[PDB]
């Protein structure tokens, strides 16, 4: 609809931390927590990669596993 | 040793892709392939996060694995 709620980065909030990730849709997405918001929402990884690269890196760094 | 300079990012090359990783020293390092150069170098992950975040992201994205 014309007046759909802004989502994700369109809301104009500062990203805080990525809570989780999923590629259900065939696009990789993150569940983003925003500063001073209790209302997390899904953003495209390609968008997060550009707008908050250090937040995306921190997510991946938290989830490094050494197979060998 | 003192004369092993320049190394890593100090070579002034454009990062192409991270091809490996190591933690043997306590600090995470990446094996960096530079555009147009056969010799890959070890660079601190903290430095790569600053200098070429998208390269870091691309590396992690390629190794993201889902579990069941």
């Amino acid at each position: 609809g014309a007046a759909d709620k802004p989502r994700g980065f369109a809301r104009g909030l500062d990203p805080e931390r990525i809570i989780g990730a999923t590629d259900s849709s065939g696009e990789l997405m993150f569940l983003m927590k925003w500063k001073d918001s209790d209302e997390a929402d899904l953003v495209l990884a390609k968008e997060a990669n550009m707008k908050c690269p250090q937040i995306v890196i921190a997510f991946y760094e938290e989830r490094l596993t050494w197979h060998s | 040793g003192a004369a092993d300079k320049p190394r890593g990012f100090a070579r002034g090359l454009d990062p192409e892709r991270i091809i490996g990783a190591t933690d043997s020293s306590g600090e995470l390092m990446f094996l960096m392939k530079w555009k147009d150069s056969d010799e890959a170098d070890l660079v601190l992950a903290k430095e790569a996060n600053m200098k070429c975040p998208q390269i870091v992201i691309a590396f992690y994205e390629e190794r993201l694995t889902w579990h069941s």
Binding site: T22, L31, T65 | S24, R63
Partner: peptide, 15 residues
């Protein structure tokens, strides 16, 4: 709607 999956970055120590 806000489910997410178990995912890690699978690295291989060089040493």
């Amino acid at each position: 709607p806000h489910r997410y999956r178990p995912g890690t970055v699978a690295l291989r120590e060089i040493r």
